[PDB]
Amino acid sequence: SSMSYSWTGALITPCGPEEEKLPINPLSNSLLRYHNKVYCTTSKSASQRAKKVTFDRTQVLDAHYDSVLKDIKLAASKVSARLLTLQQACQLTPPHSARSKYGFGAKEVRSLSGRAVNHIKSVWKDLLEDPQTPIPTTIMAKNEVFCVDPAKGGKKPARLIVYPDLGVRVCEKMALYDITQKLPQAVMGASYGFQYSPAQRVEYLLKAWAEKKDPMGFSYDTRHFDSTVTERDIRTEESIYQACSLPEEARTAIHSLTERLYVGGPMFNSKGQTCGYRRCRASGVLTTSMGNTITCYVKALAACKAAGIVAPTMLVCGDDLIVISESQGTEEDERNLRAFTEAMTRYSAPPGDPPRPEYDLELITSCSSNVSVALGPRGRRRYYLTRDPTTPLARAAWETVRHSPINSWLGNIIQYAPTIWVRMVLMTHFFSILMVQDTLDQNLNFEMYGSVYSVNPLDLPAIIERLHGLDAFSMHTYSHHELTRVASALRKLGAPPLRVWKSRARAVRASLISRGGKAAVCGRYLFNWAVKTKLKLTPLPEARLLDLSSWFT
RNA sequence: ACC
Ligand SMILES: O=c1ccn([C@@H]2O[C@H](COP(=O)(O)OP(=O)(O)O)[C@@H](O)[C@H]2O)c(=O)[nH]1
Ligand SMILES: [Cl-]
Ligand SMILES: [Mn+2]
Ligand SMILES: [Mn+2]
Structure with a gap:
């Protein structure tokens, strides 16, 4: 004893x-x-x-x-x-x-x-x-x-x-x-x-x-x-x-x-x-x-x-x-x-x-974290990992002389790419901020398990396809639990509701596209959820070339 | 602080 x-x-x-x-x-x-x-x-x-x-x-x-x-x-x-x-x-x-x-x-x-x-x-x-x-x-x-x-x-x-x-x-x-x-x-x-x-x-x-x-x-x-x-x-x-x-x-x-x-x-x-x-x-x-x-x-x-x-x-x-x-x-x-x-x-x-x-x-x-379910591009059940977005959103707003929250946004976008809260809220915010800063093409650190990985924001579509699959860009009809939890967390932190995010995302998508190149790929792939007439999203060649083994091992 |  x-x-x-x-x-x-x-x-x-x-x-x-x-x-x-x-x-x-x-x-x-x-x-x-x-x-x-x-x-x-x-x-x-x-x-x-x-x-x-x-x-x-x-x-x-x-x-x-x-x-x-x-x-x-x-x-x-x-x-x-x-x-x-x-x-x-x-x-x-x-x-x-x-x-x-x-x-x-x-x-x-x-x-x-x-x-x-x-x-x-x-x-x-x-x-x-x-x-x-x-x-x-x-x-x-x-x-x-x-x-x-x-x-x-x-x-x-x-x-x-x-x-x-x-x-x-x-x-x-x-x-x-x-x-x-x-x-x-x-x-x-x-x-x-x-x-x-x-x-x-x-x-x-x-x-x-x-x-x-x-x-x-x-x-x-x-x-x-x-x-x-x-x-x-x-x-x-x-x-x-x-x-x-x-x-x-x-x-x-x-x-x-x-x-x-x-x-x-x-x-x-x-x-x-x-x-x-x-x-x-x-x-x-x-x-x-x-x-x-x-x-x-x-x-x-x-x-x-x-x-x-x-x-x-x-x-x-x-x-x-x-x-x-x-x-x-x-x-x-x-x-x-x-x-x-x-x-x-x-x-x-x-x-x-x-x-x-x-x-x-x-x-x-x-x-x-917990497993949830949504529907994929062909209407099949697709399972993915999610979590209460409360802590990620709070960390997304930790901003001091010594600390920028941008790396935090990035870490959540990568880990939780298929989630409704990442797709509608964090991706929208991240890309809007970097675009307005004109720093889209500057590498950022993604921190995991104490290791740090340098990531370019414009490579996210390839990275996400590799890690989560192409389904991560076409999930829809999220679960009651998840819709409820996300809406509640946004209210609790005083963030705009999902419908406002959808409007912001339309405009972020159009700005990205207008830039052409890798930016336009980000717009088409990461924000296909935001538009009335969906685009047909095909496998990205660059994703085949990626080895992300060490990230989660 | 370690992974
Ligand atoms: O920043 C951290 C967080 C957790 N842990 C370890 O992981 C255990 C389990 O963490 P949990 O989040 O379950 O909290 P706890 O069980 O300590 O209340 C802790 O007791 C620590 O030994 C750690 O070393 N550093
Ligand atoms: Cl499907
Ligand atoms: Mn514990
Ligand atoms: Mn624990």
Whole structure:
């Protein structure tokens, strides 16, 4: 039995000055009017979060768990992984990664400066030689943007981010980067959710649904997952990494990282003051995503067995889970789900919201998204991935000296291209703004899973065809759920309604077309929905030539 | 902060 955290009373402090909202939002004040509703989480609310994630865990495992873990270790044993060289690990450091306390930053790391390389040499040697001394961490509040929600308390408190010095972060990669690239896929196979594009995720869920004689589905998410992860879960994570075939030196670093960093340690705020002690997942270590996903998978698969879920097909992404299985009748389904939740709760993975069984695929939300349905160019049902557009619209209106929301618009257009809210609202706004700026042909960054991809706005039609298919330009007759949710979100943020967007889009389309070239292709393909007499849209040659593999894997 |  253990407390997730203990605290000294020292504040969780900010890094520098927190971003200020301005009196005019010139890029987004034609998108929506209720800018008062759009806020960024700050260190100010960090103490409120701290309180909500500090609690006593008392975990109890059973034979279901023991049996699943056994099978996972076995599957792990088929993996061979290597150390990264110090230098390879250095080059995987993101360009703005928070600098070391020891006199260098990401720039020096990525260029293999001598002082940075030498410091990292001594960090690595010290990991091989001291398997015990706790490694210090910094605790920080995440800054992210949401729309106020009266129901859910108004403003969400900032999540807590916990990470070690840059020098240690490089070492983590040396020991574990290769494992992060191989282990989840080896132990989960098709259940590993991170490997799928939106269309592929959709295809997978539909496939799973059609395979059952009488399907039932549900989603699950753990409340404050990192805080629920126990010291023992983390040692079990090690035992799973150690089941791979590894060179001896990696075994030793992995063990030291586990005991000195991953299982816990002292936390300092940005001012250097002792803040607390952690006995749970540090979100910010290399193993955050792999560890979350695997430990979620272990618990959830064991809980399925404990609950009597028949013929489970799982999709797991971090602490986000969908299970599609054979219905045993709604009465047993409901009982089985309570047993599932009970087992997860024993396993120290308690729910934010209790799960419930569903028998219609539209009604299952996971990873903030859900499958919906519309009609394609030949009048066939077409399934696609959508989500509540509230957060995307709020982020679309985050505009400060330090931050442009244009990249946000782009990321949503790519990921959610077939949706009614992207097609009618975000595409219309994006193209209008860039045209008026005369920056249509300037490349933008599309950010995904921490990676960044340079995209030209005028290549979107090819990109969208490749990622979502040509159907993405002719979806119509969207679902009641989706029409309702979109209209409501637009009202809530003070944006024009869909019919006004349709009028704006007509004019955006005509302006694009009038420019000829790739712009006119954007107009014809991306806004064929806006005109009375549809055009016949044919496969784009450039789309065949595209390889977008890495974007969603 | 990590993916
Ligand atoms: O910016 C983020 C968001 C989430 N997570 C990790 O993913 C887990 C699940 O996140 P979720 O969105 O379900 O929120 P939580 O379960 O933390 O309340 C977290 O506990 C973190 O370990 C993270 O590392 N960074
Ligand atoms: Cl069709
Ligand atoms: Mn969660
Ligand atoms: Mn989650």
